[PDB]
Design a binder for this molecule. Structure first.
Ligand code: HEM
Ligand SMILES: C[n+]1ccsc1
Length: 291
């Protein structure tokens, strides 16, 4: 399967910076969502789940085709709760009907991270919508109730290595688990709509307790009111993972730099970019624009 990036006709940096600003302006406006967390965390989760279907072996799945717009992927049990990120973006797609679905879902994730004061993420245009029959089947996204060997093995399919996996998981400092979506409940920290390295700090400094929640699932709970998933706590159980966790709890700039590279790579897996294709765009935030 080859998927070649095709820039939307005649579009350039300024067009996509207009779509960025539209998403970012609505993130500021619709602030009440999920008890004032706002839409940013569900939008970086949506960009991860449309990319996380990729399989390196046959180049199926991935962010290129925008296939989450089809019922099979929209109704995947693993995507429960992401309909709220879709409905947030649907106004903006009506306003810029020329951007492809893959591009709009991935730029929403980029915009949310930078607007929640994360690192800049280089983003590239050119994903092309593909037919309903290209939609990957349910079951390619990871279970939460498993251990470190499962996480390592699952992420080899998206060929991410240990460092990349640990840098990507730092995004679980954002938002929260919702019992009616996943059977898990609670936030992982106090700053859950500002991008920081707090996931790593909480993992190493809190007093975790294995408890059973109302959906009868086990999760790691702390006195402070935070929770960690079994696959999250996995990172301090494995010796290779645990020493990268310590590296990111001791250096927030290295965390930001490595997250930026692994999230771009995540979003680009499966796509062939021609050598005459434009460079990756670095978008300015509303704040850097005085907007
Ligand atoms: C083995 C890996 C992973 C598993 C099992 C997993 C699982 C989960 C689960 C069960 C939730 C709760 C969903 C809900 O109830 O609403 C969640 C939320 C979230 N995850 Fe993951 N995740 C994984 C990796 C990642 C990665 C790599 C990213 C992003 C780079 C990510 C970003 C998020 C975000 C931002 C949320 C919060 C959503 C919200 O607030 O609504 N996840 N994760
Ligand atoms: C620990 N955690 C927070 C959001 S998803 C998992």
């Amino acid at each position: 399967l080859v998927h070649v990036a095709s820039v939307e006709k005649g579009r350039s940096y300024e067009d996509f910076q207009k779509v960025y600003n539209a998403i970012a302006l609505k993130l500021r406006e619709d602030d009440e969502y999920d008890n004032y967390i706002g839409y940013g965390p569900v939008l970086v989760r949506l960009a991860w789940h449309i990319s996380g279907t990729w399989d390196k072996h046959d180049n199926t799945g991935g962010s290129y085709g925008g296939t989450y717009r089809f019922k099979k992927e929209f109704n995947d049990p693993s995507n429960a709760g992401l309909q709220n990120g879709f409905k947030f973006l649907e106004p903006i797609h009506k306003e810029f009907p020329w951007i492809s679905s893959g591009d709009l879902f991935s730029l929403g994730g980029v915009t949310a991270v930078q607007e929640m004061q994360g690192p800049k993420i280089p983003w590239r245009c050119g994903r092309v919508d593909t037919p309903e029959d290209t939609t990957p089947d349910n079951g390619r996204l990871p279970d939460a109730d498993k251990d470190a060997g499962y996480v390592r093995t699952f992420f080899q399919r998206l060929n991410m290595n240990d460092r990349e996996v640990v840098a990507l998981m730092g995004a679980h400092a954002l938002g929260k688990t919702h019992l009616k979506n996943s059977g898990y409940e609670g936030p992982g920290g106090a700053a859950n709509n500002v991008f920081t390295n707090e996931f790593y700090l909480n993992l190493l400094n809190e007093d975790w307790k294995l408890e059973k929640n109302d959906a009868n699932n086990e999760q790691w709970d702390s006195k402070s009111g935070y929770m960690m998933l079994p696959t999250d706590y996995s990172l301090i159980q494995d010796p290779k993972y645990l020493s990268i966790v310590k590296e990111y709890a001791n250096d927030q700039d290295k965390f930001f730099k490595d997250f930026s590279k692994a999230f771009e790579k995540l979003l680009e897996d499966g796509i062939t970019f021609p050598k005459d294709a434009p460079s990756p765009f670095i978008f300015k935030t509303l704040e850097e624009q005085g907007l």
